[PDB]
Amino acid sequence: HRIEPVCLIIRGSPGTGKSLATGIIARAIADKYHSSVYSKQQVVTVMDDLCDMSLFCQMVSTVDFIPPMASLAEGVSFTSKFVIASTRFYMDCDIEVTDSYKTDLLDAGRAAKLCSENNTANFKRCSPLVCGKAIQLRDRKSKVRYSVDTVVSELIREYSNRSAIGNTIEALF
Amino acid sequence: HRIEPVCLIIRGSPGTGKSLATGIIARAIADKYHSSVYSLPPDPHFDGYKQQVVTVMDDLCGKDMSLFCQMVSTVDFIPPSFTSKFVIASTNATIRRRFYMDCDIEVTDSYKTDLGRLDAGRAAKLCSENNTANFKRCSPLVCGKAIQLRDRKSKVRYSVDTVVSELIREYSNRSAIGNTIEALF
Amino acid sequence: RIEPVCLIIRGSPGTGKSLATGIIARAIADKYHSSVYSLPPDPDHFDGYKQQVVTVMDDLCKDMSLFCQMVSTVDFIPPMASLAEAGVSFTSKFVIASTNATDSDAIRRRFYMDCDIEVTDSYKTDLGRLDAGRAAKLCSENNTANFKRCSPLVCGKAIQLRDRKSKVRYSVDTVVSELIREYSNRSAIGNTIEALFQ
Amino acid sequence: KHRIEPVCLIIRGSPGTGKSLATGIIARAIADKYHSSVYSLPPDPDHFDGYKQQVVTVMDDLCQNPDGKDMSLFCQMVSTVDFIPPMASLAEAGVSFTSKFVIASTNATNIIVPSDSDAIRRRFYMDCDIEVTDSYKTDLGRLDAGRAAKLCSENNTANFKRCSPLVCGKAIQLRDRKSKVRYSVDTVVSELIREYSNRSAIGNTIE
Amino acid sequence: HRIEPVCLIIRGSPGTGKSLATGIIARAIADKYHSSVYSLPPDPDHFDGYKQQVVTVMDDLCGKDMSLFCQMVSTVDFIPPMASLAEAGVSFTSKFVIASTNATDAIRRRFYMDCDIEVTDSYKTDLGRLDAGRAAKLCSENNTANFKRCSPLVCGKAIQLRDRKSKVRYSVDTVVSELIREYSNRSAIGNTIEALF
Amino acid sequence: KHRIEPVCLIIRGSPGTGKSLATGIIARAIADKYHSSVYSLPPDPDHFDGYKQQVVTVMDDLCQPDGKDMSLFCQMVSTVDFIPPMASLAGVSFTSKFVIASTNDAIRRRFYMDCDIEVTDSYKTDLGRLDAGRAAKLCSENNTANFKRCSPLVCGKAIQLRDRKSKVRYSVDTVVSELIREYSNRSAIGNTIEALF
Ligand SMILES: [Zn+2]
Ligand SMILES: [Zn+2]
Ligand SMILES: [Zn+2]
Ligand SMILES: [Zn+2]
Ligand SMILES: [Zn+2]
Ligand SMILES: [Zn+2]
């Protein structure tokens, strides 16, 4: 059977543009792993607007899982290393828009620009959406804040330790 | 309905290593496809059948093969459904449209016993080198040193590894286009 | 017998020319409640041929000596590999074949329809070939005469054929209508003649 | 009354991968270095008619499938022991086999070693798979001989008067199964020549 | 050395056309290469007149003939006997050898094709012979690959040729097309090799 | 030892009249018929590198001046053998069956046709030159003799070629049909003599 997939769910109110986070997050994870995002044995699968829970609980597990397809059968057991959800959770995070980057009533127009400096970890270029300047993440069963860049740093680190240990443990048996 | 699974039947005498061959063959094919291997009993119900990519039919001996003509069929099956892509079987010393390959297993004199059977103890002990496609290390069973499969039609002798690679290619052949075709019907 | 109606589909590798013959044979076999016999490349025997309505000859290039025999009104008794199924006559109503990029008249006649496969630019991958994976995606809508569910392969979105003589454009669905129609009209002629003499 | 074992190359490959071109060219070049010629053994050989002690004998399609007559012939040619091969006509009967090199080819996966396996594989000095590169690949995944034959503009070889993609590696390579090292026609010639120059230096330093 | 020439043999009883087939086959082939035919006499002794013609013919091959035949169809230089000191010296470099012989080890290996010749029933004379006059009479339609006018001798209506290993049938026209194909192969191969050295 | 003179076509136009679209497509259609390809000479050329005896060779911008192009041209279009320059020391006699050239005594006798290009005013920009973006939209119908699919370039809708010597207008597809007819006629000539005898 399989390593449990590391998974990040993003809780927030509409207009926070959470899909802008799970998108930026998944892409940046599928690149490191030279892959794409699924929304064919992809690395990351994005599950946006999660109310679904029987289908989730069957992805994020250690069992072997075969998901339904429209086409009959067709080599496809679910193997995605990461699951990013927006609404088993390695991380469980609240979305927070800095008041500065809020519209009259999130202001993506302003929140998406290129800061002069590029001090990122996982992005070829920097922005307020990844520098933490415009948007932050807080685990709720741990009181740590993240930027888009540092949450993707965490999730790659955690998958790596889980794989090393989880792989040599299964060898024991 | 389905693409008829590729099937190999390994014919051999006793002491020839039939179920070492079939064992290893189906298990390497599984490992490629992130699946496992259902061991059908000799004189076979289908308890434990959990849509494994491969199922091994040992000591084919008729009760047995009226069930085989259903497993290796293009139509569907609900065994006392069956979606395994591969069937590896083995029979006595001495329908066939279903056998994609039909191999006589054969032991090299070097790994023969004094009583003229395979020397599995030694044959099982690993070789240092790996000129192999489907295994992370080989033994004289995978490499043709101890165990070889001679196609009955071709009359040619192959190693287990190369006959593996051929069962995977002949299914990738069926699989490419034929999958979306039925998806349409 | 009634000369089977033949479609040859000419296309370079990658334009998806055996998706076409595959779907076309399968769709004509269903309409006629049969199946499809696929005749292997460089055929020596016809071993699974139990009188399916459609036989497919992919990658036809010993090929045209055969091809000449199947697509005619003369009696063909193909060679079998097992005696247990020998002696039967070749009676498929349709022969769908595909071949390479581009006596000679001896064949040209056999083709009721001689088509080129085209790949729409929208479904053309980087390397100038069919976008195989995208084109299988079912369509929301099914405006087809012959299929239970539509797809860019069936209706005209990914691939289309074009008769070389007539220049008509066709989709997999429309070409199916065109082959069936022709057989209906051949069967209709031949029937009324054998109705006057049985 | 015996001799230095000929340095032997076997080339394994699917048909239509340049296998017989490669044997052709390696033989001819090696033959050029030693100012001799190529004797080509026929398939399923019965008799060596035409074998005039050429430095290289080529043995294409070793072990076509019939009955193993080929591996017994090959074990006699590639040995230290004297060998007087049969001939159809009496006009050239009695000549000893004295090729310094023997180049053979066969299919990709067939096992030609019958029985006494470990001693046979020793005779092969190099036991190579033939691979076409993917630019020179063509539909059906086989070699496009026409293009692979256009003369290269450069000649970096060690052994050829002129160079084409069959010679320098651009179109066809060989990989030594045991060493996993990739070679072109040009560099496996140099290896074969170095190994023979090696065996002659020994024999004569010991005698 | 030289490319072994591709060789065809036409086994047939007398008056089954066997000698017309070799002449027609050899002439057409020689025409395609812009050359002529050198025809060995029966019970050949010498090669007088041989000027390295693309094709040489050998009829009633019955061993003087054999030992002789076996050196023509080879890789190894064969300078054949002359009866005129002025001619002698020439090596044998013909690209094809066409031969015929009587009704019924290592030789069989040198025949690139080996054929029984067949007179079709229609054209059999009153007693199991070729009706040469009528078979020579020309055809109105011309579907041959290698003659500018057609005739039963060439398209397969009069005489046919049956290969004894492949059991395949040929007309004079088609066997001329196999042979030209089979030299083109060898030609092409040994060509790129020679170009390189 | 000498060659059927290739048939030539020159397309005299101001630049921006799809002069280049015209020669490009014309050359490809002809080469696709003869199962070959097209060798494009750079304008004001010096070497023929890449020449492999493509059936069609193209000669963009003829007389751009100083006689460079024209001595090259008179040699390509002739009966006398021709060995063009190579800049890579790379058998390359010039043997192309057609020469399509575009520009801006014994010379004007080698032209088979000698044509002005002409946009039709339905497809003229406000600034005077071919609206390429519209002219390359595929036509739905295909009445052409030499194409898989039709375009106002192929077709005569957007681009036309008028012979100066005779006053016949042409489309890409019908000039293609005339040029082929001419070439096959010149190779008929050997076959038509042989017919009368
Ligand atoms: Zn920033
Ligand atoms: Zn091994
Ligand atoms: Zn559709
Ligand atoms: Zn090179
Ligand atoms: Zn005739
Ligand atoms: Zn048009």
Side-chain angles (χ1 to χ4, degrees):
Chain A
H1 74 73
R2 53 192 253 253
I3 311 165
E4 177 191 58
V6 301
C7 167
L8 155 69
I9 185 169
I10 293 180
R11 291 191 167 66
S13 292
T16 52
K18 287 183 297 295
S19 61
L20 276 146
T22 60
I24 293 186
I25 283 156
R27 170 79 182 263
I29 294 172
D31 262 18
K32 296 281 162 183
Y33 289 93
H34 309 306
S35 175
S36 66
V37 183
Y38 178 56
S39 294
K40 65 176 86 74
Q41 305 236 296
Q42 291 105 316
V43 184
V44 183
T45 72
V46 162
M47 185 160 168
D48 262 296
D49 310 322
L50 191 162
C51 309
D52 281 24
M53 275 299 285
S54 52
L55 186 147
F56 182 116
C57 284
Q58 293 178 62
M59 276 175 290
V60 182
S61 161
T62 86
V63 305
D64 288 328
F65 181 51
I66 304 90
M69 322 286 276
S71 290
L72 296 175
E74 283 229 85
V76 191
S77 71
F78 184 84
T79 58
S80 300
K81 293 172 181 184
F82 307 75
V83 183
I84 283 74
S86 79
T87 172
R88 316 211 169 186
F89 322 121
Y90 169 48
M91 310 231 310
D92 196 331
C93 292
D94 282 326
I95 195 66
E96 294 184 8
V97 174
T98 64
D99 207 89
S100 157
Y101 288 83
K102 283 183 193 245
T103 55
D104 286 10
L105 300 170
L106 174 62
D107 198 325
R110 305 177 60 248
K113 177 58 162 60
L114 308 202
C115 319
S116 167
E117 68 281 346
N118 177 348
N119 287 334
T120 57
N122 309 3
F123 298 108
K124 59 259 194 191
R125 61 177 194 287
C126 169
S127 202
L129 285 143
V130 299
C131 189
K133 291 189 186 167
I135 175 174
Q136 299 254 29
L137 293 181
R138 175 184 68 88
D139 214 350
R140 295 193 336 202
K141 283 195 150 214
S142 163
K143 314 321 199 62
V144 181
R145 258 160 290 154
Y146 294 113
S147 63
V148 171
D149 184 29
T150 68
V151 56
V152 179
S153 297
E154 162 73 344
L155 298 203
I156 279 169
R157 166 167 52 264
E158 169 56 10
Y159 182 75
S160 300
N161 308 131
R162 203 175 299 193
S163 78
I165 304 156
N167 271 314
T168 59
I169 291 178
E170 292 172 356
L172 273 63
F173 296 108
Chain B
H1 83 77
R2 59 179 176 185
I3 46 179
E4 184 177 24
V6 302
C7 159
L8 162 71
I9 186 160
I10 299 194
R11 296 188 173 67
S13 201
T16 48
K18 274 177 305 202
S19 81
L20 285 139
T22 69
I24 306 165
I25 287 169
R27 170 55 181 268
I29 291 172
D31 277 44
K32 306 302 303 308
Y33 294 115
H34 311 331
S35 193
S36 71
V37 189
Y38 177 76
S39 287
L40 207 66
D43 220 27
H45 53 98
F46 269 59
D47 280 276
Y49 188 57
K50 207 177 51 45
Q51 307 246 315
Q52 287 97 341
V53 166
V54 193
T55 76
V56 182
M57 185 154 187
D58 274 334
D59 287 341
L60 214 90
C61 288
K63 180 180 176 179
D64 285 25
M65 75 171 335
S66 178
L67 192 151
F68 165 86
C69 285
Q70 307 174 66
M71 280 186 298
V72 175
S73 62
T74 58
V75 311
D76 210 278
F77 189 46
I78 312 287
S81 39
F82 184 81
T83 70
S84 286
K85 311 171 165 176
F86 302 83
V87 170
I88 289 108
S90 48
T91 185
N92 48 12
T94 50
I95 310 151
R96 40 214 182 274
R97 294 178 178 81
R98 294 153 180 81
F99 301 138
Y100 171 50
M101 298 187 67
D102 183 3
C103 272
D104 292 290
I105 194 171
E106 277 150 14
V107 192
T108 61
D109 287 12
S110 170
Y111 284 95
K112 269 179 174 215
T113 56
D114 290 325
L115 58 77
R117 291 184 164 111
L118 170 69
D119 204 340
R122 200 166 67 263
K125 91 179 185 105
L126 293 45
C127 277
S128 59
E129 61 181 350
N130 203 27
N131 275 75
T132 298
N134 309 43
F135 307 80
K136 63 178 178 294
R137 58 193 194 272
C138 92
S139 44
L141 277 65
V142 175
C143 181
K145 300 181 178 181
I147 297 301
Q148 290 174 17
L149 294 183
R150 188 203 312 265
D151 189 272
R152 173 178 291 178
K153 300 289 182 291
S154 95
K155 296 176 290 294
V156 180
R157 319 182 322 259
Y158 304 107
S159 87
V160 153
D161 181 64
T162 79
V163 50
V164 180
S165 292
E166 177 67 42
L167 304 181
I168 290 171
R169 75 183 274 285
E170 176 61 10
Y171 179 72
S172 295
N173 205 44
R174 285 186 183 65
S175 304
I177 291 101
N179 299 332
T180 185
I181 293 184
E182 266 90 8
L184 177 70
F185 298 95
Chain C
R1 63 193 202 240
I2 323 183
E3 207 210 6
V5 308
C6 180
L7 173 68
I8 182 143
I9 291 172
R10 318 190 106 105
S12 75
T15 59
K17 77 179 176 261
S18 57
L19 267 164
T21 66
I23 296 144
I24 289 160
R26 185 65 188 269
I28 300 172
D30 259 328
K31 294 290 169 300
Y32 284 80
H33 294 307
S34 80
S35 63
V36 180
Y37 172 71
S38 314
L39 192 39
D42 215 26
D44 281 292
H45 41 81
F46 273 57
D47 290 330
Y49 182 71
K50 69 178 65 182
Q51 297 211 307
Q52 296 77 335
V53 166
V54 183
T55 176
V56 167
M57 270 204 299
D58 269 306
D59 293 324
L60 188 139
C61 269
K62 178 174 54 173
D63 276 1
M64 311 298 333
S65 300
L66 185 43
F67 176 73
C68 272
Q69 293 185 67
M70 294 182 286
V71 185
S72 70
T73 71
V74 305
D75 211 333
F76 188 44
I77 305 286
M80 306 301 247
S82 51
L83 298 153
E85 294 177 339
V88 76
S89 281
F90 180 85
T91 61
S92 285
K93 312 193 176 229
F94 306 87
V95 183
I96 313 320
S98 73
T99 180
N100 78 359
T102 69
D103 37 18
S104 204
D105 304 4
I107 309 131
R108 185 183 66 251
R109 295 181 177 74
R110 316 262 175 192
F111 306 144
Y112 171 73
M113 276 181 60
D114 184 8
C115 292
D116 279 285
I117 191 162
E118 292 188 14
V119 199
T120 66
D121 210 30
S122 167
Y123 276 97
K124 173 166 296 189
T125 63
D126 303 351
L127 299 184
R129 297 199 157 190
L130 178 87
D131 205 321
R134 257 219 296 146
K137 290 184 305 302
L138 295 80
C139 304
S140 303
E141 71 283 14
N142 180 9
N143 293 321
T144 68
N146 299 299
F147 297 78
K148 293 183 290 295
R149 66 199 83 198
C150 159
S151 157
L153 295 157
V154 182
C155 54
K157 285 183 208 171
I159 59 176
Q160 313 164 345
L161 315 171
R162 188 184 53 87
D163 190 332
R164 266 141 94 103
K165 274 58 189 187
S166 74
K167 295 178 182 303
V168 172
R169 302 177 197 218
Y170 292 87
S171 67
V172 155
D173 174 50
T174 46
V175 58
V176 163
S177 281
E178 173 57 22
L179 300 168
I180 296 194
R181 179 170 80 254
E182 175 70 27
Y183 191 88
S184 279
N185 174 80
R186 298 181 179 195
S187 182
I189 299 168
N191 287 25
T192 68
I193 287 177
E194 276 91 49
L196 229 37
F197 299 102
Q198 87 284 7
Chain D
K1 295 177 167 180
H2 74 49
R3 64 201 216 242
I4 292 160
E5 167 192 45
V7 314
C8 178
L9 171 72
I10 177 160
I11 285 167
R12 297 178 206 259
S14 310
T17 62
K19 198 167 48 182
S20 64
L21 281 63
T23 63
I25 293 180
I26 301 160
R28 177 54 179 276
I30 284 180
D32 268 22
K33 302 299 177 181
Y34 298 105
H35 310 294
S36 66
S37 39
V38 179
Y39 174 69
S40 291
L41 215 55
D44 220 299
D46 269 283
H47 57 108
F48 281 50
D49 285 8
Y51 172 79
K52 189 147 52 63
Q53 293 182 333
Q54 293 89 329
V55 174
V56 179
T57 166
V58 167
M59 190 172 195
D60 265 357
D61 287 359
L62 184 77
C63 280
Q64 295 189 137
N65 312 326
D67 280 324
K69 223 189 314 173
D70 275 20
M71 288 306 295
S72 99
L73 214 69
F74 171 96
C75 292
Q76 302 169 92
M77 311 191 225
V78 183
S79 65
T80 40
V81 172
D82 219 327
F83 176 52
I84 308 285
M87 302 261 175
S89 87
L90 302 157
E92 63 260 5
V95 306
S96 273
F97 192 79
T98 60
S99 282
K100 299 166 172 165
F101 307 88
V102 179
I103 270 53
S105 72
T106 193
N107 304 116
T109 63
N110 55 348
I111 303 188
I112 59 189
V113 186
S115 297
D116 303 303
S117 66
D118 279 355
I120 298 200
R121 287 183 218 195
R122 288 181 186 176
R123 294 176 216 236
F124 312 143
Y125 175 45
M126 292 159 97
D127 179 1
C128 272
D129 286 279
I130 199 171
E131 309 165 349
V132 195
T133 50
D134 295 295
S135 35
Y136 290 86
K137 270 299 185 195
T138 51
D139 52 349
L140 301 172
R142 295 181 183 170
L143 181 145
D144 170 32
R147 195 168 75 264
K150 65 192 180 75
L151 290 185
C152 297
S153 168
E154 73 274 345
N155 186 9
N156 288 319
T157 69
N159 300 311
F160 292 70
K161 310 163 160 186
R162 64 190 60 88
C163 186
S164 90
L166 307 156
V167 178
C168 61
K170 305 169 162 174
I172 60 163
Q173 321 212 337
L174 307 164
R175 194 177 58 114
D176 193 332
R177 294 178 61 98
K178 312 239 171 196
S179 172
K180 294 178 183 297
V181 171
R182 280 192 239 82
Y183 299 84
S184 67
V185 166
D186 183 54
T187 67
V188 70
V189 160
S190 305
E191 195 45 18
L192 291 183
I193 285 189
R194 290 165 184 187
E195 165 71 356
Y196 184 82
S197 292
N198 172 56
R199 291 176 177 191
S200 162
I202 298 311
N204 282 269
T205 41
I206 279 154
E207 187 89 58
Chain E
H1 51 54
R2 73 177 183 278
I3 295 168
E4 183 205 44
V6 55
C7 161
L8 160 68
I9 179 141
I10 294 169
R11 299 195 161 74
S13 89
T16 58
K18 165 228 311 194
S19 320
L20 286 160
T22 72
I24 288 142
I25 289 167
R27 162 69 164 282
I29 299 178
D31 267 11
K32 295 236 168 306
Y33 294 77
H34 300 312
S35 169
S36 33
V37 164
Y38 176 80
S39 302
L40 269 274
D43 287 345
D45 279 279
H46 36 104
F47 284 66
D48 268 18
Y50 186 80
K51 300 185 255 82
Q52 291 199 331
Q53 287 93 355
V54 170
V55 186
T56 87
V57 166
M58 209 170 170
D59 292 332
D60 310 48
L61 184 137
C62 288
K64 264 195 187 183
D65 313 45
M66 290 312 310
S67 81
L68 174 42
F69 158 68
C70 274
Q71 316 170 42
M72 303 193 246
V73 192
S74 158
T75 69
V76 318
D77 214 30
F78 173 61
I79 302 95
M82 308 295 226
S84 164
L85 275 66
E87 300 208 23
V90 168
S91 52
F92 189 105
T93 72
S94 275
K95 297 182 177 168
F96 311 74
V97 168
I98 280 59
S100 59
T101 171
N102 65 355
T104 53
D105 178 288
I107 306 150
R108 300 178 65 253
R109 175 173 295 103
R110 289 177 196 198
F111 299 152
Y112 167 63
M113 293 170 58
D114 162 18
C115 287
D116 308 90
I117 188 178
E118 289 187 18
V119 185
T120 48
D121 192 65
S122 166
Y123 287 95
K124 291 226 185 58
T125 76
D126 284 73
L127 301 169
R129 259 181 157 247
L130 173 89
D131 176 19
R134 279 213 303 110
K137 180 180 177 58
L138 304 98
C139 302
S140 327
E141 70 291 3
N142 186 356
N143 298 255
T144 69
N146 304 297
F147 303 83
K148 62 204 195 218
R149 298 169 185 187
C150 180
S151 157
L153 291 172
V154 174
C155 52
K157 307 195 254 259
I159 60 195
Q160 265 164 56
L161 299 167
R162 198 187 45 84
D163 191 10
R164 271 155 81 113
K165 297 176 179 179
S166 76
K167 292 170 176 185
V168 173
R169 293 178 187 282
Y170 295 88
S171 53
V172 172
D173 173 87
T174 39
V175 76
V176 156
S177 277
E178 196 58 38
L179 303 173
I180 292 203
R181 158 163 55 259
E182 172 53 66
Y183 185 75
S184 279
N185 167 268
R186 316 165 165 200
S187 193
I189 302 161
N191 211 288
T192 44
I193 296 189
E194 190 61 9
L196 179 66
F197 305 85
Chain F
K1 207 238 162 217
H2 59 101
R3 42 204 264 254
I4 311 174
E5 176 207 35
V7 317
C8 169
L9 161 53
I10 175 161
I11 296 188
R12 305 198 163 171
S14 168
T17 48
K19 193 203 319 165
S20 156
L21 276 153
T23 70
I25 299 146
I26 290 190
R28 180 80 167 256
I30 297 169
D32 272 18
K33 289 263 172 301
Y34 294 88
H35 294 25
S36 182
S37 96
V38 179
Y39 178 79
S40 328
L41 195 59
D44 194 56
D46 273 326
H47 61 113
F48 277 60
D49 289 0
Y51 195 72
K52 292 192 279 93
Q53 314 229 313
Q54 289 92 23
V55 173
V56 191
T57 183
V58 174
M59 193 153 202
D60 280 355
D61 275 280
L62 192 67
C63 296
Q64 212 50 68
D66 265 340
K68 290 169 68 168
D69 316 328
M70 289 312 291
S71 173
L72 299 165
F73 164 82
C74 302
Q75 302 171 71
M76 299 185 270
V77 182
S78 88
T79 67
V80 304
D81 197 321
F82 183 42
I83 320 290
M86 294 313 218
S88 64
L89 285 166
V92 188
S93 33
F94 186 92
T95 50
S96 271
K97 295 175 196 166
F98 311 79
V99 180
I100 308 298
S102 78
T103 176
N104 294 16
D105 293 14
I107 299 181
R108 67 188 179 266
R109 338 261 171 95
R110 314 194 159 107
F111 298 164
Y112 177 73
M113 286 158 67
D114 177 355
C115 289
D116 301 303
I117 185 141
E118 278 184 345
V119 186
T120 72
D121 217 330
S122 316
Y123 281 89
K124 182 180 182 177
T125 309
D126 268 318
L127 304 141
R129 296 191 299 267
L130 166 57
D131 181 359
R134 252 161 45 63
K137 72 201 174 60
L138 273 61
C139 310
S140 319
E141 72 274 355
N142 195 357
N143 296 322
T144 70
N146 299 292
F147 282 80
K148 268 98 76 184
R149 60 182 68 88
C150 189
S151 175
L153 313 146
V154 184
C155 184
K157 287 297 211 173
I159 293 310
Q160 268 169 70
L161 302 163
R162 55 163 308 259
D163 199 19
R164 297 177 61 183
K165 298 171 183 183
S166 78
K167 254 149 221 181
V168 184
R169 278 182 245 183
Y170 285 87
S171 79
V172 158
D173 170 68
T174 56
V175 82
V176 163
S177 279
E178 181 52 46
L179 285 180
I180 296 153
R181 163 163 58 256
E182 176 55 26
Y183 188 77
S184 55
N185 178 40
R186 299 175 180 197
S187 319
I189 283 172
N191 195 29
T192 73
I193 308 184
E194 173 182 61
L196 283 175
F197 301 101

